Design an enzyme around this catalytic site. Sequence first.
Site, mmCIF file in Angstrom:
data_model
loop_
_atom_site.group_PDB
_atom_site.id
_atom_site.type_symbol
_atom_site.label_atom_id
_atom_site.label_comp_id
_atom_site.label_asym_id
_atom_site.label_seq_id
_atom_site.Cartn_x
_atom_site.Cartn_y
_atom_site.Cartn_z
ATOM 1 N N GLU A 36 -2.752 2.161 -7.526
ATOM 2 C CA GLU A 36 -2.704 2.170 -6.208
ATOM 3 C C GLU A 36 -1.257 1.446 -5.625
ATOM 4 O OE1 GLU A 36 -4.529 3.510 -3.582
ATOM 5 O OE2 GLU A 36 -6.142 3.865 -4.582
ATOM 6 N N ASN A 40 2.405 3.861 -3.895
ATOM 7 C CA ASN A 40 3.312 3.430 -2.530
ATOM 8 C C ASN A 40 4.957 3.660 -3.034
ATOM 9 O OD1 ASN A 40 0.542 1.849 -1.570
ATOM 10 N ND2 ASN A 40 1.166 3.642 -0.627
ATOM 11 N N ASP A 67 9.886 -2.264 -6.730
ATOM 12 C CA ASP A 67 10.762 -1.016 -6.691
ATOM 13 C C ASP A 67 12.259 -1.629 -6.108
ATOM 14 O OD1 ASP A 67 10.799 -0.913 -4.060
ATOM 15 O OD2 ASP A 67 8.811 0.020 -4.038
ATOM 16 N N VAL A 91 -4.988 -4.243 6.729
ATOM 17 C CA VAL A 91 -5.963 -3.399 7.295
ATOM 18 C C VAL A 91 -6.465 -2.260 6.628
ATOM 19 C CG1 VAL A 91 -6.250 -1.847 9.295
ATOM 20 C CG2 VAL A 91 -5.175 -4.154 9.548
ATOM 21 N N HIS A 102 -9.766 9.125 -5.823
ATOM 22 C CA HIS A 102 -8.671 9.147 -4.778
ATOM 23 C C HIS A 102 -8.272 7.934 -4.181
ATOM 24 C CE1 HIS A 102 -7.579 11.774 -0.995
ATOM 25 N NE2 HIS A 102 -6.354 11.755 -1.934
ATOM 26 N N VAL A 106 -3.458 -0.193 -0.540
ATOM 27 C CA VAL A 106 -3.093 -1.479 -1.098
ATOM 28 C C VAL A 106 -3.820 -2.636 -0.297
ATOM 29 C CG1 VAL A 106 -1.153 -1.986 0.140
ATOM 30 C CG2 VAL A 106 -1.407 -3.238 -1.844
#
EC number: 5.6.2.2
Length: 205
Positions: A36, A40, A67, A91, A102, A106
């Site tokens: 997960e 991103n 990254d 949130v 699926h 984060v």
Amino acid sequence: SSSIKVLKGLDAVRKRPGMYIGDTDDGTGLHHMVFEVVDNAIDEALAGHCKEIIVTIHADNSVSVQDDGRGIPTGIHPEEGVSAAEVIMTVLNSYKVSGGLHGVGVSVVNALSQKLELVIQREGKIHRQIYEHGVPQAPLAVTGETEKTGTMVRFWPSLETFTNVTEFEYEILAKRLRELSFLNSGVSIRLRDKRDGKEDHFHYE
Ligand SMILES: CCNC(=O)Nc1cc2c(-c3ccnc(C)c3)ccc(C)c2cn1
């Protein structure tokens, strides 16, 4: 308030973790936590901003993902009253296997981590926020200056959630990170295990 609602969300995840992150007793969920976070960074690579992702397994059983992209936005949007980064981090799969899970975001990883650290390099500045099961210690803040840009998430999975398979398996992460660098061609992914010195570099040109 958002605080009470944020806590209500985090509590929902912690009470039925399997549903969100995958099975918590066979390693599915545990390793999905890494994937997960990686996903991103992959989106940031696919949009042309990040060239390399580095996944590090630390000797204390935490994992960091870093990254070289643009950095998660840091400004406070008028509607929420805290940094956009903190919103993203806070949130808001039970019987899924491996690639059948699926993506859930984060904030789930955050809820199910004893500790999580976010470090953003963006707009000339180093920004830091620390969480304990999703609860920030303080507002995102500036801790230094930098010409570099990128995002790094390091998380310590909670043993209140994960049982049996509690330590990361190099081979699970290697297999799936290689597949991810194949499925998102051009993006370089490195895997480093500080427990035993193993490293790999996955990149399809
Ligand atoms: C170590 C993990 N790396 C990132 O999350 N990189 C990342 C995420 C971004 C997100 C983002 C983060 C988490 N979840 C979502 C849906 C978006 C939004 C906007 C920007 C510019 C990002 C840049 N780098």
